[PDB]
Structure 1
């Protein structure tokens, strides 16, 4: 299968036609997505198979072929870009200043951008093009607007 670094759509033919259920990042031979996109199932890349290697429902993350490789972090001050990959539409960069999720266990950056559920797993990047987390696990606020955490894993 295709192992080139970059952003990929995650598709299924189980439903009507070919449906995009999410997005992920290929980096250093490892495929990175959110757990709620694949539910930990194996994936196909052409004639090849990608098996899950690590995952955690609470973090809502999963890696395939190897351990989680993404370790860049939002600096807490600068604008970032969501590299949105919406279903049936071209990859597009959206620049934004993250807000914050304040939790009992610390603060996390959050992006107030609303895309279809199938955009989950799209990468959020810093000005060096490094992936600081994945978009797609968040909350619906007072006025009905969607806000995603910037979800990042740990590089062991």
Structure 2
């Protein structure tokens, strides 16, 4: 239940299917990582609480807690947790997804699929969204996907 970034694993052997963020007793990840399935954490079980396929987000144990947003000007850091690798920080200046409903920050970083759900951070260390829903231009570009608190 400790705050932090977590691998999301599945079981012959084990495979990392994604990443998520524990904050304020709530686990945050991308819908496409878990499809809302229950998660084991030690001897405990985490059940989904809120989720939305269009936003590609899901929270466990309580409502979505992450609310910081990219300021539109500053570099950010992807706290990538790739399969088989130590958590590591990748700094970048986001580009922009321009949509009919407004602009979304986007990071032009291409890590393995099991990195989906890794948090993107602002300079204060706040999570401004999660990595792993995006488009191809041949490079992948991820939206900075943030929920509503």
Give distance in 2, aligned partners of 1:51 and 1:136: 22
Give distance in 2, aligned partners of 1:22 and 1:89: 13
SS across alignment from 2:109: coil
SS across alignment from 2:120: strand
Structure 2 unaligned segments of length 5 or more: list them.
none
Give deviations 1:83-123, integer Å, cap 9, x for gaps: 00000111000000000000111110000000011000000
Give distance in 2, aligned partners of 1:146 and 1:85: 17
Structure 1 unaligned segments of length 5 or more: list them.
none
Give deviations 1:48-101, integer Å, cap 9, x for gaps: 000000000000000000000000000000000000000011100000000000
Whether 2:123 is the aligned partner of 1:118: answer no
Give distance in 1, aligned partners of 2:100 and 2:26: 31
Give the TM-score normalised by the residue count of structure 1. Answer: 0.94
Number of aligned residue pairs: give it: 148
Give distance in 1, aligned partners of 2:51 and 2:88: 27
SS across alignment from 1:37: helix
Q: Residue 36 of structure 1: CA displacement?
A: 0.1
Q: Residue 17 of structure 1: CA displacement?
A: 1.1
Following superposition, which runs of at least 4 residues in structure 1 exceed 6 angstroms of deviation?
none
Q: Residue 28 of structure 1: CA displacement?
A: 0.2
Superposed counterparts of 1:100-111, under 5 Å: 100-111=96-107
SS across alignment from 1:36: helix
Corresponding residue number in structure 2 for 1:46:
42
- CA RMSD across the alignment: 0.5
